[PDB]
Amino acid sequence: HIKKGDNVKVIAGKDKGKEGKVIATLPKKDRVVVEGVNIMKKHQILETEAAIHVSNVQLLDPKTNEPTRVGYKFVDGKKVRIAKKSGEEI
Amino acid sequence: GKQCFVTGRKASTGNRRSHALNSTKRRWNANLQKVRILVDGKPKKVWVSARALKSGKVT
RNA sequence: GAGCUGUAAGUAAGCUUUGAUCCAGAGAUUUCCGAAUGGGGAAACCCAGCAUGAGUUAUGUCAUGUUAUCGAUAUGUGAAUACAUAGCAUAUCAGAAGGCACACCCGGAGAACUGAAACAUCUUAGUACCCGGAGGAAGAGAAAGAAAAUUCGAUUCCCUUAGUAGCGGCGAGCGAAACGGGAAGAGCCCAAACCAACGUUGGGGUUGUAGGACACUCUAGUUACAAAGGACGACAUUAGACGAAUCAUCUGGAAAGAUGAAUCAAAGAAGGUAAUAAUCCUGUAGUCGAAAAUGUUGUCUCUCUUGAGUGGAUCCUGAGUACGACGGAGCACGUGAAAUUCCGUCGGAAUCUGGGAGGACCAUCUCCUAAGGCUAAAUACUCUCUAGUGACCGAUAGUGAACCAGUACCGUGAGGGAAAGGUGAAAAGCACCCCGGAAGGGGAGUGAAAUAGAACCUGAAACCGUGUGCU
RNA sequence: GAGGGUAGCGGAGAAAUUCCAAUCGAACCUGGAGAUAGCUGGUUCUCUCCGAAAUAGCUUUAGGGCUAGCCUCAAGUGAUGA
RNA sequence: GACAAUGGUAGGAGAGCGUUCUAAGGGCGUUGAAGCAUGAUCGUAAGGACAUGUGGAGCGCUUAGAAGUGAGAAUGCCGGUGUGAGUAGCGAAAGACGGGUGAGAAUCCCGUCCACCGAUUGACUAAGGUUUCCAGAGGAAGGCUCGUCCGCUCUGGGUUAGUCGGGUCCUAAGCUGAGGCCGACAGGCGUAGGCGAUGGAUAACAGGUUGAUAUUCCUGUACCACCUAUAAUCGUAUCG
RNA sequence: GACUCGGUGAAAUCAUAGUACCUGUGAAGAUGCAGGUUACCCGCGACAGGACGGAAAGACCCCGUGGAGCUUUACUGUAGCC
């Protein structure tokens, strides 16, 4: 759904409308870690990042650099991901 | 576990009544006799009712 | 198609695009007890024989197969006792055993409390309990029937007849059938007369408008009964994949809310997202997809197969059977004027001019053909598998059990049987400073909130303490 | 002392209605079963109008019933009431 | 307007309040819902509003429908908390002092004195219990007081057999029984044969050692059964 | 043992309680009613006249067309025996 090492835009939360890069994926709990957002403070005292819901992020279009949805069209024998509102392959 | 070998007679169950119509359980038994009959193997002694011995049976 | 080694943390050491982990179909391994089956036994243990093999100069030791009982089939099989037959030793057998849903069905045996305002006939009740046999359904089933019309035509189940006719210390009370309207709906095979062998196996034959043997000119495989084994392509389950549509400002920790402007809809069912979302995510409407296993179905294979009526010399059509008496039972019907049908004892018939029934019995009419055997459907029930619903409960409620509950615990034993749910959106679960031996507390810090600090959402009353105005 | 036997419509008793798991004129557990009780106890919000009886008869009846007397609501006849 | 009536047990009749759910219509709510607390408010009654604190996500209003619809009593059921009350009791009994440990000592360790049993409060072992046994740490709960201690908590350890008791030996009383007998079913009894010690048969003693084992480990000296290769003597042996 | 101090620390009972006496009254024997007479507020150790004092829904007597055990020339049956 949202693979690691992608470029996403946050649409809901404290750090909304801020682009980042996905660094970790937890599909059991449906949580995605985005770089640079949702900073946490743990008394051990260090500053690190926390997890955000996968439903609060949308992938960035390669051309317009705007949020969009995901689709599939079977260009080759395998399966590839495309973007709605356009035809560019992600 | 006693029964007629030729026909299959067996005891039954019923009521015993009095003049005042009080009822108690009783049994009607078959008139079985221990008689030797012809068998394919050894001639053995089996329970055969007196009714079966009528009409002509071996002994 | 990218993460994974369960709850469960946490630390190590690892695997994975050369396809980890996961879903589905198909295979292999599967300790010991338990019907337990080599013998024994206080289940989860002990002790052997026989045949091979592994190690020891040799015993000791170990591994792999087999050895229970009963029953059914071939062989050898003195007895006492001449031939034989009881006992015996072998060979074979997807032969039997035990459990299961305390639901449905058919048999054997069979109470009491209670009602009658006492009680014995009666009722409770052929109910509860016990035993036996099965099946996915079981039981019944092809007129010796119902009746009185210018008739019908196997069985089963629903409505009505009807609380009627009846039964009853005529008290309490018990209580039908036929007709009529519907669901479902096919009927056949054996014994005898007769025909050729050596009592046997084949053919023939199955009935009431009377059928058949005998003599007469005499032609639809139904594997759910009707006779029993196999080969031919289409749907349905057991994993899934595509699948339309939204952006701003205000409050706020967070927007899905409000104010404004757009879009989709064979998709406005539902769940989750930091708050109440048709257009954020998983989905829904619609369509597509199957290696392999398992069901149903239909077009050819394959396996059986004698189709019609007039005449009736003679012969055949179920015997200790029908029926009667005595003592019981069951029919709604308590022996009563009790027909119709079952059991025990004793007597005991006839052979189409025959026999049975039409509620004692006789006569006349009408209907039918017992004493042999099978048969799907409509009907009843839910331990389970998939998909759904409710003017049903919301932690003293709902299953006894929302937590690892038939658990704790109580009893020698059968048996009885609980209490216990909630931090926050995110563990971000208080670094650091001060009082101790520690528990605890005061600051600082995380968080919107810490009197949300894990004995954690709100937080009533009983009850226990501190200070104050009047007395 | 140890190993065993006799089981409730039954056992054992030098005999007391004595004992059979702290219980015995008939043990304990589970079912029929929510047995029966003409007998005690209990029965949850608020207002307005009307308002008794503790008597006769019968009764296997006497602290229980049934009919009649007395209370309440509705529809009818119309001086029949004190 | 004018008049008349309005005490009440059993019981009869009528109009109403409040709670939970459903249909339709119309509303409120993070600028704060239900719930909880207070107030000097409203109606003829059951009852209805408003404001302020806490609370953090749902809830009223109108007309109809339905019912697990209203609590002070049943020696009622379950949970919590009082009075008796700082009251009764703290389960046979002789302790005193010095030194240590420690935050804290009448109650814990070490030493001295005194005291009690001694046909037993001493030493073994059968049944039964099942880790309560040893060492090092700890003080929430258990100990009828305290506790630095423990049969209590945490972490690690401890049981060694040819000769001892049981089986590869034997049978009492009883139990189970191939065939067999009896019995509505289920099953009862019983022959050959087995199971079954509290009995019979059967080869080892002494000393030392650890915090925990001792006819078991070690040292010294024995015994019983079985197997293997030459041998004295033996082919009428010898075994049964 | 009880009594004082230190440590620990229950129970039966309980409608709410600021709980006097005499003569009367009363469902006929009053801390709570009438009249009068006594009595400043709060503790501790003792005794037992009352609170018809506390445990036990009176086993004595009676009632129920309630139970159970026993007896006989009560009634109706029956296991066995002739």
Instruction: Compute and round to an integer the Cα radius of gyration of chain B.
Output: 16
- Does at least one atom of strand C sit less than 7 Å from the CB of A29? no
Residue ranges of alpha helices (H) inside A2-58 are none
- The residues spanned by each domain of chain B are 1-59
- Does at least one atom of strand F sit less than 7 Å from the CB of B19? yes
Could you tell me the two tokens for B16? 């015993």
Is residue B12 within 8 A of residue B22, CB to CB? The reply is no
**C1' nearest to CA of B16: which nucleotide?**
C328
Residue B26 CA from chain centroid, whole number: 16
Is residue B36 within 8 A of residue B48, CB to CB? The reply is no
- The C-alpha atoms of residue A21 and residue B45 are separated, in whole angstroms, by 102
